[PDB]
From TrEMBL, chain C:
Residues of the full protein shown: 436 to 531 of 820
Protein name per its UniProtKB record: Uncharacterized protein
Organism, scientific name: Francisella tularensis subsp. novicida (strain ATCC 15482 / CCUG 33449 / U112)
Superkingdom of origin organism: Bacteria
Length: 508, 144, 96, 38
């Protein structure tokens, strides 16, 4: 020559108890484990824990473009030895995890992982001479910066100097900030505040608003984690993200038919958006107040008589403009469950293209080249190999596909920070006189320069002696409690700040 | 189940009439009953207060007149946007002082609930200098 | 029959002998900060652990601010740095 | 199955409003009805 073929995958998946998988010649999974010391370097015990023909029950690996999260369950035996003592009987010990995978089919395909797990207040070991273990996964820059919460003030520092002066990890990996140059623009004042949140979540948030990219990457030969922060996707990424294996074909070969399970959609391009009319309720702005927001895209119809208003907080400050955003529409998402790592296709998350020659997907007839944006790896040790190795593996892989034309960065959930309070003086000069003991002086342009209350005073105000909207760009000088800086403070802490005139006042 | 809403901020003027005079440029006037009608600070003044010149509990049902940024209405606005609002007298004051809110000042207004507006801060002045603060040091009121 | 000391009749009554966390050797520094103009002492001081023989990390800080209101700023809410303990779960089929 | 315009434009796009008219008969010696519009 359809239940003869439809039930055939069931007894195939029932024979996954003991693994009966075509066309895998051999699949082994390796885990190295190292300790990480007091000062973030490496030690020895093959001089480690290393893994083989598995003790492992079940490991779970997902990938974003930036992160790796999941679980690990393996076995050891038995009590008692120093090789197993000091690692997993103490929390907060950082642990490198080096995972390599070969897949022999007439060729081999590799995937390699470097991840850090450590944790407070939770270690998990189950028993009944046989011991279980559990370990969570994080990519290295996350898990180290997760348990790190400082808050201080910086002056005249570009952003990449802030990250390179909080990063103390050189026997582990590096981060490469030499291509962005949005982050190398110097800001006159800087307010780090990990009040109730994570510095890693601070690290994403200001990286979010500049609208940059992150990429996680490992050398397969040999392991070096190296991030990248790029404003675009260029040739200078793809000089580095060429996959270091071969038989690297594209275009969805007809050997994929033997390896799928489910071909699942999430949303697609619509033709119906909701209007989003901006509103800035502001007496004394002599323009339109209602204007529309702007879509990135066209050929999409609006609805009728349904609005999404977008107000703004109107404080005493001279009201600025305009936080130019878009109206974020949908994309094109395909989940693909398959039983093996696919033959003849590049299942490595590059920021490249993958052509669409055919229509065996749900897909769309219009859409050209695509790319990959996730993985999942539920691995299960087979039931048979969990008997003799208990007396003396399965695979399931998904993928996230998006449109290459709809390429955008991806960011995880985090916390927007919370405010906090600071008390401070006002001074003007330093060697201040005595008949000039208590005067007042206003400063121009983030510099100690005598400004005026003139000169700003927009065209309804030239002039009586009356300020409307209590204008910004007039600065005070404020001494701080000095201990909110770095220890390398070759500075005098003076934060310039704008003015509420209406503190010691009336309107009179 | 649903969501109880959250507050938000609105900035607005004060006017009294429309074709306002020039010796009547900056005065103050209080309005009665959700209508443009000259009220008094008398007449409300419950029975412990008739009378010295002292308001306890800063009574409601005394209304200001406040122009809004006009674009917070429908497109069918055959109206002039003037939300009447109650009074904090204690803004430009002490317990000694009495400076009522004149016209043509710009004012923070929360909307604390459905049909509860209040007045918090002031965003304007009428007396500053325009010189470099090495030649003048002005400290003053203005009056009437 | 109130004995102690884990008699050898317990072997007939266990199912699983499960750990939760233990004493580490690695704590995170927690440097106190009171941002206060006109306190003429140190503003940064460390917090104090209850215990010793535990190594710190390096170049990782947990700041601990304080709300600074108009009040004469007091001191110091003398707390500790709460470490881990030693936890054993013991599933058994009878009262031991 | 794949592919036809009757199934194309409905369920391959979000934010398309969709009326759902559900009717139920229940024959027992009589019938009882319930009807839904959603």
């Amino acid at each position: 020559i359809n239940k003869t073929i439809i039930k055939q995958l069931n007894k195939l998946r029932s024979s996954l108890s003991r693994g009966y998988n075509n066309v895998l010649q051999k699949q082994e999974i390796t885990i190295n484990i190292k300790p990480i010391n007091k000062n973030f370097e490496l030690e020895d015990i093959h001089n480690s824990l290393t893994l083989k023909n598995p003790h492992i029950e079940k490991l779970e690996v997902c990938e974003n473009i930036y992160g790796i999260n999941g679980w690990l369950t393996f076995d050891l035996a038995y009590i008692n030895n120093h090789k197993d003592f000091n690692f997993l009987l103490s929390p907060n010990q950082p642990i490198l995890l080096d995972i390599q995978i070969n897949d022999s089919f007439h060729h081999k395909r590799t995937t390699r992982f470097i991840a850090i797990g450590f944790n407070s207040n939770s270690i998990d070991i189950h028993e009944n001479g046989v011991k279980k273990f559990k370990i969570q996964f994080h990519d290295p820059l996350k898990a180290l910066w997760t348990k790190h919460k400082p808050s201080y003030i910086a002056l005249n520092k570009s952003l990449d100097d802030i990250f390179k002066d909080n990063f103390f990890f050189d026997s582990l990996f590096s981060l490469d900030t030499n291509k962005s140059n949005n982050l190398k623009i110097r800001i006159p004042q800087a307010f780090i505040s990990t009040v109730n949140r994570n510095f890693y979540d601070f690290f994403i948030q200001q990286l979010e608003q500049n609208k940059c990219y992150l990429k996680y990457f490992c050398d397969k030969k040999s392991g070096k984690v190296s991030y990248h922060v790029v404003d675009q996707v260029d040739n200078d990424l793809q000089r580095n993200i060429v996959n270091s294996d071969e038989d690297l074909k594209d275009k969805l070969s007809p050997y994929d038919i033997s390896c799928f399970k489910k071909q699942i959609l999430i949303s697609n391009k619509s033709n119906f958006y909701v209007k989003e009319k901006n509103i800035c309720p502001d007496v004394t702005l002599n323009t339109q107040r209602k204007e529309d927001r702007k879509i990135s895209d066209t050929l999409v119809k609006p609805f009728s008589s349904i609005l999404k208003d977008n107000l703004q907080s109107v404080e005493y400050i001279q009201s600025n403009n305009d936080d130019k955003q878009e109206i974020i529409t949908t994309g094109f998402e395909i989940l693909l469950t398959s039983r093996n790592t696919l033959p003849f296709l590049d299942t490595e998350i590059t920021l490249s293209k993958l052509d669409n020659d055919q229509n065996y997907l749900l897909g769309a007839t219009d859409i050209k080249s695509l790319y990959i944006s996730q993985r999942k790896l539920l691995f299960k040790r087979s039931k048979y190999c969990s008997k003799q190795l208990y007396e003396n593996h399965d695979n399931s892989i998904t993928y996230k596909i998006k449109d290459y034309s709809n390429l955008t960065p991806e960011y995880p959930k985090y916390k927007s920070f919370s405010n906090f309070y600071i008390n401070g003086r006002i001074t003007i000069g330093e060697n201040v006189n005595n008949d000039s003991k208590k005067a007042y002086k206003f400063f121009k342009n983030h510099k100690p320069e005598e400004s005026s209350i003139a000169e700003f005073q927009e065209n309804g105000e030239k002039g009586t002696s009356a300020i409307l909207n209590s204008k910004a760009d007039i600065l005070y000088a404020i001494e701080i409690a000095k201990e909110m800086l770095s220890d390398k403070s070759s500075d005098k802490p003076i934060i310039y700040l704008p003015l509420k005139v209406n503190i010691n006042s009336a309107n009179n | 189940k649903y969501k109880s809403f959250s507050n938000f901020y609105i900035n607005g003027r004060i006017t009294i009439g429309e074709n306002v005079n020039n010796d009547s440029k900056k005065a103050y006037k209080f309005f009665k009953n959700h209508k443009p009608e000259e009220s008094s600070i008398a007449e409300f003044q419950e029975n412990g207060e008739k009378g010295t010149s002292a308001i306890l509990n800063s009574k409601a049902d005394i209304l200001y007149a406040i122009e809004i940024a006009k674009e917070m209405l429908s497109d069918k606005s055959s109206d002039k946007p003037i939300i009447y609002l109650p009074l904090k007298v204690n803004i430009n004051s002490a317990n000694n002082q009495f400076i009522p809110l004149r016209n043509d000042d710009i004012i923070l207004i929360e909307i604390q609930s459905f049909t509860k507006g209040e007045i918090i801060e002031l965003i304007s002045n009428s007396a500053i200098s325009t010189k470099k603060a090495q030649q003048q040091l002005l400290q003053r009121q203005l009056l009437g």
